[PDB]
Design an enzyme around this catalytic site. Structure first.
Site, PDB file in Angstrom:
ATOM      1  N   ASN A 268      -9.506  -1.557  -7.061  1.00 47.25           N
ATOM      2  CA  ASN A 268      -8.645  -0.543  -7.651  1.00 47.25           C
ATOM      3  C   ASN A 268      -8.427  -0.745  -9.145  1.00 47.25           C
ATOM      4  O   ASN A 268      -7.598  -0.045  -9.739  1.00 47.25           O
ATOM      5  CB  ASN A 268      -7.298  -0.509  -6.923  1.00 47.25           C
ATOM      6  CG  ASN A 268      -7.360   0.274  -5.624  1.00 47.25           C
ATOM      7  OD1 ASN A 268      -8.108   1.245  -5.507  1.00 47.25           O
ATOM      8  ND2 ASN A 268      -6.575  -0.149  -4.637  1.00 47.25           N
TER       9      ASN A 268
ATOM     10  N   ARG B 124       1.211  -4.251   6.539  1.00 47.61           N
ATOM     11  CA  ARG B 124       0.567  -3.283   5.663  1.00 47.61           C
ATOM     12  C   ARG B 124       1.261  -1.939   5.811  1.00 47.61           C
ATOM     13  O   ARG B 124       1.417  -1.435   6.928  1.00 47.61           O
ATOM     14  CB  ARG B 124      -0.924  -3.142   5.965  1.00 47.61           C
ATOM     15  CG  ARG B 124      -1.580  -2.020   5.172  1.00 47.61           C
ATOM     16  CD  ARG B 124      -2.929  -2.436   4.628  1.00 47.61           C
ATOM     17  NE  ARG B 124      -3.471  -1.449   3.702  1.00 47.61           N
ATOM     18  CZ  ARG B 124      -4.730  -1.428   3.287  1.00 47.61           C
ATOM     19  NH1 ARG B 124      -5.612  -2.317   3.714  1.00 47.61           N
ATOM     20  NH2 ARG B 124      -5.113  -0.492   2.422  1.00 47.61           N
TER      21      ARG B 124
ATOM     22  N   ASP C 103       0.829  -1.194   0.000  1.00 45.43           N
ATOM     23  CA  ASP C 103       0.000   0.000   0.000  1.00 45.43           C
ATOM     24  C   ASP C 103       0.869   1.251   0.000  1.00 45.43           C
ATOM     25  O   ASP C 103       1.916   1.293   0.655  1.00 45.43           O
ATOM     26  CB  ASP C 103      -0.927   0.003   1.218  1.00 45.43           C
ATOM     27  CG  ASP C 103      -2.095   0.957   1.065  1.00 45.43           C
ATOM     28  OD1 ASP C 103      -2.204   1.607   0.003  1.00 45.43           O
ATOM     29  OD2 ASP C 103      -2.903   1.060   2.011  1.00 45.43           O
TER      30      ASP C 103
ATOM     31  N   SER D  92      -5.605  -4.674  -6.025  1.00 52.30           N
ATOM     32  CA  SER D  92      -6.928  -5.094  -5.596  1.00 52.30           C
ATOM     33  C   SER D  92      -7.901  -5.064  -6.769  1.00 52.30           C
ATOM     34  O   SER D  92      -7.688  -4.373  -7.768  1.00 52.30           O
ATOM     35  CB  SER D  92      -7.442  -4.196  -4.470  1.00 52.30           C
ATOM     36  OG  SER D  92      -7.981  -2.995  -4.991  1.00 52.30           O
TER      37      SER D  92
ATOM     38  N   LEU E  53      -7.108  -4.433   6.908  1.00 48.86           N
ATOM     39  CA  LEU E  53      -6.711  -5.576   6.098  1.00 48.86           C
ATOM     40  C   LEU E  53      -7.318  -5.543   4.703  1.00 48.86           C
ATOM     41  O   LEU E  53      -6.752  -6.145   3.784  1.00 48.86           O
ATOM     42  CB  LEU E  53      -7.092  -6.887   6.799  1.00 48.86           C
ATOM     43  CG  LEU E  53      -6.120  -7.507   7.809  1.00 48.86           C
ATOM     44  CD1 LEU E  53      -5.130  -8.415   7.087  1.00 48.86           C
ATOM     45  CD2 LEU E  53      -5.372  -6.451   8.618  1.00 48.86           C
TER      46      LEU E  53
ATOM     47  N   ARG F  83       0.021   7.378  -3.317  1.00 47.58           N
ATOM     48  CA  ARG F  83       0.447   8.517  -2.508  1.00 47.58           C
ATOM     49  C   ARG F  83       1.918   8.836  -2.735  1.00 47.58           C
ATOM     50  O   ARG F  83       2.309  10.010  -2.777  1.00 47.58           O
ATOM     51  CB  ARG F  83       0.189   8.241  -1.028  1.00 47.58           C
ATOM     52  CG  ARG F  83      -1.278   8.245  -0.631  1.00 47.58           C
ATOM     53  CD  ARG F  83      -1.436   7.896   0.840  1.00 47.58           C
ATOM     54  NE  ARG F  83      -0.623   8.758   1.690  1.00 47.58           N
ATOM     55  CZ  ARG F  83      -0.264   8.463   2.933  1.00 47.58           C
ATOM     56  NH1 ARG F  83      -0.649   7.339   3.516  1.00 47.58           N
ATOM     57  NH2 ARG F  83       0.501   9.317   3.607  1.00 47.58           N
ATOM     58  N   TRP F  84       2.752   7.803  -2.876  1.00 51.14           N
ATOM     59  CA  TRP F  84       4.173   8.031  -3.107  1.00 51.14           C
ATOM     60  C   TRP F  84       4.405   8.752  -4.428  1.00 51.14           C
ATOM     61  O   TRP F  84       5.250   9.651  -4.515  1.00 51.14           O
ATOM     62  CB  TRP F  84       4.926   6.701  -3.080  1.00 51.14           C
ATOM     63  CG  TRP F  84       6.404   6.848  -3.238  1.00 51.14           C
ATOM     64  CD1 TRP F  84       7.333   6.916  -2.240  1.00 51.14           C
ATOM     65  CD2 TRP F  84       7.130   6.947  -4.469  1.00 51.14           C
ATOM     66  NE1 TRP F  84       8.592   7.051  -2.775  1.00 51.14           N
ATOM     67  CE2 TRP F  84       8.495   7.073  -4.140  1.00 51.14           C
ATOM     68  CE3 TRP F  84       6.759   6.939  -5.818  1.00 51.14           C
ATOM     69  CZ2 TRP F  84       9.487   7.195  -5.108  1.00 51.14           C
ATOM     70  CZ3 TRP F  84       7.746   7.059  -6.778  1.00 51.14           C
ATOM     71  CH2 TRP F  84       9.094   7.183  -6.419  1.00 51.14           C
TER      72      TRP F  84
END
Length: 214
Positions: free
Chosen positions: A63, A169, A15, A60, A176, A19-20
């Site tokens: 996503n 995570r 995860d 996912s 989760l 954002r990164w």
């Protein structure tokens, strides 16, 4: 061999790539290419610790909401080349890969399939995976076979995966999100603040020490 006190099966939810990328001004594909390098770092650290089963959740189902997904899958497959060339990890795919664009999915499949003789490690790469879909696949698998708790486990889409002992995570998210609901039922849960493309050896050591200290 394994070290007693270490987890036998580590599951990592990768995860923080989105954002990164936004914080660094990069594309999503550049973040997943770096995330793939962190997976190579992770399995190297696990090897030194004798941890032989590693499962990473890269993508996912939720996503998946096409062109970027293909770039993501391709950056992941390229970034796994060093792991494949090492000959020390048998890479397997889990999830509903039929929901992925066919050509990048085939290239990811072709990287994993070339590691059939990889040993002693097993690296499970979850793409287009959903935990509720995993459980639902068990009830359809039973139907096609024509009822114990072990029977449900036998027909999960992830039936080839054993119990997870430690879940990591990243990105500071304390959820989760349905990651392997059956196998993680009794797993130690560790939450790392760092975003996945910046996952460090300190993050890994802190996670493992938290498991041993339980």
């Amino acid at each position: 061999g394994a070290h007693p006190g270490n987890p036998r099966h580590v599951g990592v939810i990768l995860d923080g790539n989105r954002r990164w990328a936004e914080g660094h001004g990069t594309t999503l594909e550049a973040a997943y290419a770096r995330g793939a390098a962190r997976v190579a770092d992770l399995v190297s650290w696990c090897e030194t610790e004798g941890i032989a089963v590693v499962t990473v959740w890269a993508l996912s189902r939720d996503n998946l909401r096409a062109a970027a997904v293909g770039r993501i899958l391709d950056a992941t497959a390229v970034g796994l080349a060093g792991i494949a060339a090492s000959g020390r990890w048998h890479i397997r795919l889990i999830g509903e890969t039929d929901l992925l664009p066919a050509a990048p999915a085939r290239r990811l499949r072709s990287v994993a399939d070339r590691t059939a003789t990889g040993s002693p490690g097993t690296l499970n790469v979850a793409v287009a995976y959903d935990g509720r879909a995993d459980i639902a696949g068990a009830v359809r698998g039973l139907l096609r076979s024509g009822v114990r708790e072990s029977d449900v486990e036998r027909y999960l889409s992830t039936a080839g995966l054993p119990d997870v002992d430690l879940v990591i995570r990243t990105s500071g998210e304390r959820r989760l999100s349905g990651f392997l609901p059956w196998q993680t039922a009794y797993a130690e849960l560790h939450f790392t603040a760092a975003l996945w493309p910046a996952f460090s050896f300190d993050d890994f050591t802190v996670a493992l020490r938290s498991y041993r200290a339980r």
